Subunit: 227 residues, 4 copies
Amino acid sequence: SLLTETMPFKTTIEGTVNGHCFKCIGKGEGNPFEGTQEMKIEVIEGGPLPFAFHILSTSCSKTFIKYVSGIPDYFKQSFPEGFTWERTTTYEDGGFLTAHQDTSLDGDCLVYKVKILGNNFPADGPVMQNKVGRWEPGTEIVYEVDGVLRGQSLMALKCPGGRHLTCHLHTTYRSKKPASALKMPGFHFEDHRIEIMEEVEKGKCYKQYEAAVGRYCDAAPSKLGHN
Amino acid sequence: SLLTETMPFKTTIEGTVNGHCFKCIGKGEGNPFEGTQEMKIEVIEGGPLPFAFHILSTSCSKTFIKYVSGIPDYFKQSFPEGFTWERTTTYEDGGFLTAHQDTSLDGDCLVYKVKILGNNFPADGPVMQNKVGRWEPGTEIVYEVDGVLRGQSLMALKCPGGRHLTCHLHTTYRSKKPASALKMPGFHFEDHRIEIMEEVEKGKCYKQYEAAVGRYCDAAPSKLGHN
Amino acid sequence: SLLTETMPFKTTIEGTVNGHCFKCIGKGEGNPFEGTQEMKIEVIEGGPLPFAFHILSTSCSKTFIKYVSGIPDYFKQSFPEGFTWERTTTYEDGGFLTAHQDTSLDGDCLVYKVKILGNNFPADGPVMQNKVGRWEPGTEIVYEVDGVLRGQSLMALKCPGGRHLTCHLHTTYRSKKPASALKMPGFHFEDHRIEIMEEVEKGKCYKQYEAAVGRYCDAAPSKLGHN
Amino acid sequence: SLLTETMPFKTTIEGTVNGHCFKCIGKGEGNPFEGTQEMKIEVIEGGPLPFAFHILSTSCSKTFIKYVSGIPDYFKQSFPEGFTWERTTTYEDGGFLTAHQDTSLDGDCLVYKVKILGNNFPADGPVMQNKVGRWEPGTEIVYEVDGVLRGQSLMALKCPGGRHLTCHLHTTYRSKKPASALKMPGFHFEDHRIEIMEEVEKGKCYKQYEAAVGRYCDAAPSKLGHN
């Protein structure tokens, strides 16, 4: 493939959350086929962020997923044309985090352009108070709809006091390559384990890691030969 | 006030809905105190729109509301500083329309800057198929939270076949003037009657009217003297 | 009509909320055509209730609504056959209150049979802590779907600390009379002002009043002659 | 334990969905420690069901889960006292299915008592039209809250035409044994693979199988030693 064992990627992020404008830049690399990656995000405008960086964790990279059981790779198949994704994450305490992202292959490096609009986060909530813990790993269900791919997941942000702030992700993935030229994957799961490796600079620079896997429900046996 | 019986307003809109980028410009005028207004919106990029213009109707103007029963006017009080609003509208069939808007008073004219991110609209739904009818009037509940104003409403888009595509609006209004310098209104209702007066150019130019009123539930009598 | 200027009604309620079983009985009367009513509810089992009685306020009477502007009365038309309604109320903090009710005319008295299932209310929330204030009046949108009537509303429970615990009601009203024999009302609003007149016995007996009105959006003028 | 390699269980179900009352009885057995089970459900009242039996699949058994990685078993620990669960499942097309269930150990057999209230299912939807396919396996996130256990999952019902009708389950599990006497499990996943083995009698008798596993996200490696 046009993807190397160690693919580098750059990102530019622009957004407004609860009326606060900000801008980020980031760089990282990962193993596309092993489904691992890491990057450093830098807030170049509006820093230090007045909210937990974590609500941006999923907006910083679907090319880095390890697909097992022969599941087709919608993202890797999309190159060199690339793809885009759109999503609205709804938090159980009222917040909404909407994002649109464009993924392209510029030479030997992947390029992400991200637009973000977040709102309604409670001023007294863990996010705006910036008192969150970490993301538990999340499992997304991905299936074909309208010729494109749809995904949904429930994620849980561990917060101090033994609390879990959950949210619901509603995603749509669009290949820039015609559906006719793609091998659409069937209904499957996509585990995403996100971990902030280091807070290089409070509210201004973070190092984030993610391991992802595309699989079927291997734990529970089927009696009718279903995936 | 710095608002005249006939206030003019200009708007610039930029957004992406279901992966489709677009840009609009608009101009209109209304009677701030009578709560009526009308404007012409023009799609200057990405036209003709591949979706019903109606999902943008609420993103094109809170300065034009007629407040009765002595309810404080959070928006008019905000000038000359101005204000902003953020919102995520969730549709019953899966679509999300997120918007952020900035309202300012530039001389004798109001200026709106709008950012929009919409996604997950079903390809076969009334919106993407562009087969909608009109908006029924909508009633929003507005109340103070976190020192700012929050609003929610359920709106219904009449569609062919006697169908009603409903959605839930989640809004936050932020004055650019300190809360200390504002007279916060109590819990009340805000009726918004939106009507597209003319489709000047299919998917490219529209004339929209809106009449709004800030009131209490006058129809049902209280026994404890509640608003 | 078979309804008198002063109609009496009896109710029996059975339910489980957050694992707590309870049973109620109630009696009251109201003016069907004036849209006013009042009743005394008595918890005969599982009392005193370990949660705010208010989450049961809407489950205790659609026959008592004052319809204006010539809007057809789906409920009064349903007699003597009667009708039923089903609803799930979702609270912004995670609670769900589901109810099914049967309305019948037994002689000169209306009879309500109610089944309730509530769950997921946060133990530390206003409802389970039983620290709520009162319901603001609520406006429901009612429209025809699938030959029956559907309704939705956003309600707000004022709570101490200047807080508003909101919820979303999802209702379906089914006449026991064939749709062919009914005059289906068009899209309209139904204001419901609920007020607990007296806490006769803490967590065991309450007196509740409600004034309701079926109307169109009279506050905001239409330019196309729409209701 | 008081649980045998082959545990039998009986169930009684009572409910109303979209105004349709029904009653069921069922019997089955499974391997508690292997997390497999199967039962035959019989509609004794209101049959044949006017809706897809599948919306009742999750209301027919948490004692049959195979926990790996040393995750504590909240359900098996609850005996002989037993436990209960409450849930509201929200469908993407508007339907709600609410249930309350009581689990007890009566001798050598498990006994389930289930109450169900479903409503708002579109008359033209896959459920009321009874044109559904099968459930994809579902992954639930389970975590401690308020001293009890909470769970959430997104499930997908495959339907003809390559469609996926998804829903969101909101659950609360309550042991009848004091929390102090229980070993609360940490945040984990619970895969549930439900399969209808046979439609013994259309809309009146079904054979359902389920394999379940309590686990951590083993597919994606952690860098900080997280489960």
